[PDB]
């Protein structure tokens with residue numbers, strides 16, 4: 001397999017790049033790191049920012065989940081059709097990362113006391129992405145342009161995990177709702193998402209979702 | 210008018226690095242300053258994609274998200290590596306820079322008094338990967354990636370400049386990083402920009418903390 005993915009046995013910051021490789025018919029290796037293995041210190045000390053994921057592409061090793069998404073976007077042609085689209089692609093992925101950051105902060109540092117508050121604020125947090133779809137061909141294609149980009153898989157993941165956190169959170173957003181259904185129905189992505197290596201992986205590392 | 214417009218609060222903050230880029234690249238831009246007053250009104254905010262600043266315009270292209278603007282300028286002014294391999298390492302640096310900038314703004318705006326000692330203690334460990342990155346590329350005598358400047362350099366540089374203000378001498382433990390800052394700061398147009406009242410007379414953050 002041209003690609004290697006080193007990460008803990010969770011979906012987390014690897015779900016989107018996983019969705020992408022499967023969807024792009026790519027092949028890759030999963031190097032599963034257990035807490036035990038991680039608690040060791042060897043691997044971690046060896047990681048550039050002391051964290052996972054880590055990714056190998058030939059002699060090339062990267063860290064940072066967003067660096068890996070952009071690298072696959074760049075090499076596989078999932079980064080807009082021009083410099084203008086790339087920038088919008090970036091604007092989406094940055095917004096996706098901003099909400100992801102609030103998501104993991106809830107999950108791992110304040111689930112029980114800030115969840116209601118988090119959910120009260122969700123729609124306002126999701127509104128920008130339906131607005132983005134509303135300005136791109138009535139939201140019938142992809143988040144940016146009429147070609148899929150790495151940011152699509154990243155936003156897809158973010159939407160999927162929020163549906164679990166706050167079911168029906170999408171019900172007020174028709175374009176978002178339909179985008180999820182449409183992307184999830186792409187065959188390879190479909191089979192992947194229905195696969196045990198996805199389905200039987202928890203979303204986060206602490207059992208909350 | 211300049212084809213570039215920067216819409217921001219009167220602070221360095223998340224616009225410092227991209228202004229350094231533009232200054233250093235001899236590019237022209239307009240600054241549109243936003244007071245709290247104005248922001249407090251809500252019409253601007255309502256109109257911002259993610260309800261925040263900065264807001265950037267390149268002709269009729271409007272961008273949000275500071276790192277989106279850096280990559281856009283990096284893309285257009287050829288500050289994004291020599292090849293695709295370099296482009297990814299550049300991204301990898303910038304992601305690390307953002308990750309630390311995120312901890313910094315949290316300290317500055319939500320836990321300065323209580324958190325500052327612990328922040329300064331953990332700082333060397335946060336700075337080390339960049340020292341390591343320089344030590345792996347021309348012994349740190351060039352740029353953070355390869356032998357040509359990139360948007361990650363300006364963002365990293367700013368990151369190091371503000372940490373020198375919050376933790377004076379913090380780079381005394383990282384010779385490569387220290388030399389780097391002295392080198393880049395010495396580029397004629399950047400040095401010029403950095404000593405100018407347009408940069409100097411802006412506070413780093415919006416709450417009077419640094």
Ligand SMILES: N[C@@H](CCC(=O)N[C@@H](CS[C@H]1c2c(cc3ccc4cccc5ccc2c3c45)C(=O)C(=O)[C@@H]1O)C(=O)NCC(=O)O)C(=O)O
Nearest residue numbers: 008010012013050051052053064065066104108205206308
């Ligand atoms: N900017 C980087 C961030 C990379 C990152 O955060 N990595 C984490 C695991 S990813 C993931 C993640 C986080 C927190 C935790 C916290 C506990 C945890 C316990 C058991 C399994 C996992 C698996 C993943 C994971 C986490 C766990 C969350 O913070 C994350 O943001 C992610 O959602 C990690 O390596 N932690 C070990 C450690 O620092 O020494 C990127 O974009 O790639």
Ligand SMILES: N[C@@H](CCC(=O)N[C@@H](CS[C@H]1c2c(cc3ccc4cccc5ccc2c3c45)C(=O)C(=O)[C@@H]1O)C(=O)NCC(=O)O)C(=O)O
Nearest residue numbers: 098218220222223260261262263274275276314318415416
């Ligand atoms: N992911 C985005 C982040 C953009 C962002 O955070 N913008 C902030 C100001 S930027 C800046 C910033 C933050 C907090 C504050 C808090 C108070 C404050 C008071 C007066 C002036 C400024 C100016 C900047 C600024 C802040 C202030 C900090 O949170 C930031 O991280 C930055 O350092 C904003 O617009 N706040 C208005 C509001 O949400 O209603 C990006 O990279 O572009």
